[PDB]
Each structure stands twice: as C-alpha cells, then as structure tokens.
Amino acid sequence: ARKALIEKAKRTPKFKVRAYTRCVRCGRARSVYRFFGLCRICLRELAHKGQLPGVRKASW
Amino acid sequence: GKGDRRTRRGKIWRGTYGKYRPRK
Amino acid sequence: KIRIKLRGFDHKTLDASAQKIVEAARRSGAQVSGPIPLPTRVRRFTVIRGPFKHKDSREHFELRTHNRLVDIINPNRKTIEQLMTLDLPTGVEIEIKT
C-alpha cells in the first residue's frame, strides 16, 4: 500500500492536520524537505547529475 | 542544576523562559 | 535613487551581467556606485549517503545564493532605454527599487 497512498496524500479535503508531505519523485513519506520536494535518496541522486540548480558538493 | 525547572539554569537548559527567567 | 538587486547562482555570470550594468550605466549619464558585493546567503543540507542505515559517512551539499548590489545616482531617460530593454540574464534575477 504505497500507491493508493501517494494519491491519498494528494487529496486534502480532511482536517489540515493530516495534510502531510511526501517525496515528489519516489512515494516516500520520511526525510523529505520543505525545499527540493525530494527525499534524501532522491535529492542526493539528482544532486550528482546536476539537475539540481546551484546545488553543489558542499565544501568548507 | 540544568534539571530544575524552577531554576535560572534549569529553565535555560530547557530552552524556556518563565518566573525564574523572565524576558527582561 | 533607483536601486537594483542581483541574485542567481554562478557568481561567474552574475558578476559579469552586473558589471555590464555600469560600463553601460555611465555612458547613459549620471555616475554610479561600483558593483557592490554584499554577503552571501547559503543553503547547506546533509544527507545519509546510503539509502538505508549508515548514519556515518553521510554527505551534505551547499547552494550558494550570491547577491550583488549596484545603484545609479540620477535617473536619466537615457539610462532607462538601456536597463529596461537590455534584459539579458541567462540565469540571473534582478529586482529594482527607489
């Protein structure tokens, strides 16, 4: 049950409380971001390709 | 100690403010 | 009087696109305040390399948001033609005020 969820998550009619996030690419509910809209897994992936604007292998 | 709510430290550690650590 | 902002990412471009708006802002009349490089806001975020369980050896990235300011002293109808129509930002963004 991860298909019906991604959709169930999209719908929102019920109490804004239950309005929860979820990765845009992969149907993942954990460790998402209020930015990117990606999951740690996904993010790092795209990140390595370059499809993530201005994002760079951090260095300090 | 950092564990007593009714103390300056305690309150601080807890990251809170109150009668023992008011906002000025 | 008129203020202009310059965000974006690659400070390699933004720098040029901005610098252009001076060598071309002087020719249009009033003097200008050299391209001033204000502080950079940064976006750092860490991630656990593995797709599973390895809280160590993880990996974090950065997202440098370079900003840059410059401003014309007197608003010439001259300058206007340039600026307003010389919209040439590849990946740049500019905000203007007074």
Added chain:
Amino acid sequence: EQYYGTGRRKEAVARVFLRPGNGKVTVNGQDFNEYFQGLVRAVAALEPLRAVDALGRFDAYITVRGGGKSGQIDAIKLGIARALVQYNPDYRAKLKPLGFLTRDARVVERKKYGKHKARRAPQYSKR
C-alpha cells in the same frame, strides 16, 4: 598623530590607535582596566609596550570587536605591536625575536559528522 595596527586573533578584530602622551588605554568605549575587570590576563595585552620600555608614552585608543574578551586581549596584544611596529623602523627587534607576530592560526575546527565534538568519537559497545 595616529598610529594604527590591525588587531586580529581567532574571530576577534581589534583596532589599535597610539597617541603619544599619558598612557590611558581605551577599548570599545571604556577604560581598559574596566572593560576587562576580573581577567587576570588583561595586563598581558600591554606587555608589548613593556619591552620597546615605552609605556608612559602612548595614549592608546582601541576598539576590538568580535570573539571573546580573552580572544580580544589577544587581538589587542597584536595591534599594540603591529601598530607601533610601523612608527619605528627599528622596533622590528622584538616582533620577530620576542614572538609577538602570528595571527596564532590556532582556531576551532569543523565538527566532523560522527564525532560528538569534531574529534571526540562516540562511545563503543562491540559486544
């Protein structure tokens, strides 16, 4: 007139100014021995003058910003030196011999992931 030296030491930037005269010392708007009341390391920042020997001569006006009071005392101890080194082409005989010149590159280092404190490694079970 003005005698300045760039005071900098571990996230602490001190502005040193030397005006011949009494000996009064000021920092960010206060009497030296007052802005640093308590710190027994205060009288250390003026130690450079005490070997040039020339203390009762410069009404120093400093303004240190950023860091810790002690760190500041370090920034200062460098300005009082970098400042007066300028107005004395011969006073080089002390900033090099009596080790009074080094930014102390010594500074806090980044906390590596998986090391409570940039080095202190977590506990250990094994079992």
Added chain:
Amino acid sequence: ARIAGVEIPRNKRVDVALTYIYGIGKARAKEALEKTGINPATRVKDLTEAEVVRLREYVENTWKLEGELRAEVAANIKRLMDIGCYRGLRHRRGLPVRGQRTRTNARTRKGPRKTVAGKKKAPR
C-alpha cells in the same frame, strides 16, 4: 518554635526554615513576608516573640500545611480508585502515573530491581 502541625525548624534563617514544612516551599516562604513582614536573614533562634505568632498565624491560618494537606492528597488518589479510570489504576498497580516507559526505567515507582530471569541461546 512549633510553627505548624508538629514541625519546628532551627538555628537557620526563616526563609529556609519554613521549607521544612509539608506544604511550604520556597515560594509560599517568601509569600509569607509580603503579608507577614520579617527580614529573612534572621535566624529562628532570635526574633520577636510576636513575629513568630504573626508568622505562625499567617502560615497555619492562610491555607492548608501537613496532614489535614497530606491527608487530602490520599482522598484524590482514593477517589481515582472509583470504578478504575486509567490514571486511577497505575496507582493501583504502582506504575508510572503519566505515561512513560515501564519497559525500561520507572524504577522510581517500581519496587529495587527484582531481577529474575530468562532467554538462553544454543551453544552448538
């Protein structure tokens, strides 16, 4: 001097003294100075005979103060026994009562760690 029930602090300063009473903490301590009127730095050994009274008066008189206090406390818990509301039990089972992890800790309400034990793993 017996200020309350059967309690008598000694040769110390009242602000700390009173503390030695069930129902009187550090708060109510200084709370009986804005209404009583005494300099806390004073030891219970030396101090006007009346002060003690104006003190004892306020203290005992005002609110309620060991026993019956300590006695009401019970009742509530007793009352919790009623039909057996959740929070009512736990006190019944002597377990922590504001939802915590009985799994591990809770040794403060639990009885000494009554060890006892368990699992074994085949050697071969």
Added chain:
Amino acid sequence: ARRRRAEVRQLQPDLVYGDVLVTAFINKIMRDGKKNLAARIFYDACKIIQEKTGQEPLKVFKQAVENVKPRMEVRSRRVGGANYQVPMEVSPRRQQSLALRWLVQAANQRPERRAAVRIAHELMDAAEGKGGAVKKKEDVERMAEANRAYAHYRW
C-alpha cells in the same frame, strides 16, 4: 608514539611572578578550562601566604616543588611467569610533572573548606617538608630501592 621522539610543549610565563613553573601549577589547578578561577585560587592562596608566613610566596611554592620531585620511581615490566617492577631514574621533566601533580591532588585531599586555603597550606607543608605530597613522594621512594634486586633490568 612509535615514530617521533616527541618534543616538549613550551609554556607562557606568569603574569604576576612571570614563571613557567608557576603557570604549570595554575594549569594543574585549573579544572574544566576556567583559568580565571585557576589563577585566582593560586594567587588568592599567596594572599594567604604573607599571613600564615612572612615569606616570599614565590619561594614557598618553589621549595614545595623541590621537596617533592621524586628522585626515583618504579615502572612495571613483563618477562615471564610474573611481572617485576623495575626501579629507575626520573628526568626532571617527569619529576616536575609528578611533583606538581601530587601537590594539587594532595591539596584537594585536604579538609580545608576553601580551595585557596588548601593549595595554600598544602604549599606550606610541602615547602616545609611534611605534606601529603612529601608522603606520596616518600612512598614512591620506599617502593624503589626495596626492589633493587630486579633493578638490573634498567632497559
């Protein structure tokens, strides 16, 4: 370490008496990186030297030290069947370290309520020649010599 011989860290001279052997102590006195408290104590202790003794503080401390540098100690060693404790010389480097150490520890072991007083008195006794350190030194001494037998393992 196995590689290098390791070089001794140098110390910055005192601000009041200007002496490394002093800072060293203050350091040892310091608990949790709080020097201000470490120094004060030390000095406040000297402010309690003139009273308990019209002596120059610097010299009591100096003596106390000398009165404890252990001329010799025993360091374990393995061979076979059992471990013999070989007795051998001790370079000042370690001597000073030890002495100084023992001083602080001893102090805090004292029953004086304040800290200044402890370091204080402790300093005096030692300086004199009969402090917890003096003993902790003497003990170490006893240990050695008595094991002179196994001494032929200087290594």
Added chain:
Amino acid sequence: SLKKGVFVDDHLLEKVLELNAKGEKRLIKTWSRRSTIVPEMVGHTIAVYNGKQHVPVYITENMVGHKLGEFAPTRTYR
C-alpha cells in the same frame, strides 16, 4: 486541555439529550473515548470502544471531568 471549549463530540449529547426526554432506558454505544463526561449524564452506562469491543461502563458524578477513554483500558494485563 480546553479552557474555552469542551471538545465533547456531538453525536453523544445529541443521543444523550434526546434521551434526556423524560429519561428512558440507557444502553448506548460509542467510539468517542476521546470526548468528555457531561454532568447529569449519570445512570447512562456508555459502553466504550477500546479497539476490541465496547466496555459496558456505568457513569456517575464521581467521574466527570474525565474522558470515556480513561475508563476504557486499551491494553491487556493491568
């Protein structure tokens, strides 16, 4: 903890108030272990759900500012 309201679900009072009509029987079930006990609701034994079944719980003044949930045991072996 509610100091302006009482979050006590409506399909309760609704069914309790209409029952208030001269006061008749009582057997009444629900899943609102999350609502509050209403004064005067005594004598109205309300079987509450816990995830397994409905506990036929009586209700009396002694118990009021409570939740019908406190009265229902969620786990077993208390």
Added chain:
RNA sequence: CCGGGCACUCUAACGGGACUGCCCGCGAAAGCGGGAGGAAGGAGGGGACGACGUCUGGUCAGCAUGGCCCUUACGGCCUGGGCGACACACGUGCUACAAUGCCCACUACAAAGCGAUGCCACCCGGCAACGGGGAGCUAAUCGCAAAAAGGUGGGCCCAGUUCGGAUUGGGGUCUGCAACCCGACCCCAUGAAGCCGGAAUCGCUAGUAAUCGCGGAUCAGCCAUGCCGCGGUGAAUACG
C-alpha cells in the same frame, strides 16, 4: 543619529606568495639532520577525494527490477486501538552526588543560520506559560535575541543540605477537529535514588580533550537529552 568619508573593520571577486632557487653537514643519486629570512617551509594545517577485489555483507520497506504468490481479497476507505505494553537484561545517552559549589540581583565578549497568513520590536493584561493590540521586514539596513560560562556583591556553611530534581497531587496555557490511552510548557505543593559507582571498559595528542552557550533540518504541536553545524574558555602527557 544627520551632513559627510573609503582610512580602518568587513563583505566578495580577481591576483602575488613558497620553488629545496640560498648556506653548512652526509652521499653515486635520490635525499636526510641543522640554520636564516618569512605569515607560512621542505605535502604549511584542515576539507572533497576512498584501487583489483573481500565479507553469497546491507537494502525487493525509498526506487528500479526477473521469478513466485493474491484478486468482491494478501487490493481500497474509514472511525477506534497499537507501534508508547513491562518481573526483567543490555547499548547509547542526559542530570547529578556538591563549595574549583549552588542560588539571586546587576553588568559584558561570539559565530553561524534562520525567517510571508513567518520570525516579533514596542505597549497593555497575567506570578508565569502565554494573551489582547500593534511598528518594521520582500530582510549586511526590522525581527529570532538572551549567548553561557565569565565579572561585581549579595545569601547559604559541609548538612542529603538553599547539594540532587525523580515521583506524584492541585491549578493552568498553547498547536490541533481531537492531548484517555499518548504532546510540550507553566505555577504551587510534593522533594525519590543518589556522598563518586564490582568485574570490566571508552574517548581524546592542542585550539584537541574538558566545559559553556547558539543555529538549523524535520516540523501545527513534539516526547530533541538525538543528529548536523557554530563559537566562547581552554589543559595534562607522549621515556619508549
């Protein structure tokens, strides 16, 4: 603060610098030890970077994916419960057992980040959490905001105490439809075990260890003492 000024400081973009090119010592060389000038030497100190392969390592529950298995249910919705159970054992942690201490009033020195039905100045209400009003901010130009340890002087007096805050009772507040299971704060009253821990065992070589405070992500709220970062104070020792 206003006029006004790029000298400082700083912000941020581009450069020079250090290469065994000098001197002495050893040698066939490469190159080792010593020394000066220098901010820095002989890779200057940290980051990013981790070979062929190894553990039939981990993960089909992030995703992809072959084969197998389910189809008015091994699919889907919902309200309620559960993942928070507890005679017990372990791992990692946090607060402590105190005068190099704790409490209370006053007074300072940070860095790094963050903010649109978002952070809140400043007011009035309340002991307080917080609540009614309401300025500024598209944010080096307003706010989060207070750094804490420190410094000053004031109070405890070696006592399970003004050490330590677990436990529980009573009274509240905020987010949310909703805090019984099961939230976090607040205030009063309770003041538990603990006076330094058996056998064992861990971390760390310097701005490190130790110690103090701060930011952020996730996120309505939060069980964060976690993690990922920042800075303040600032050691001991390395014969081998």
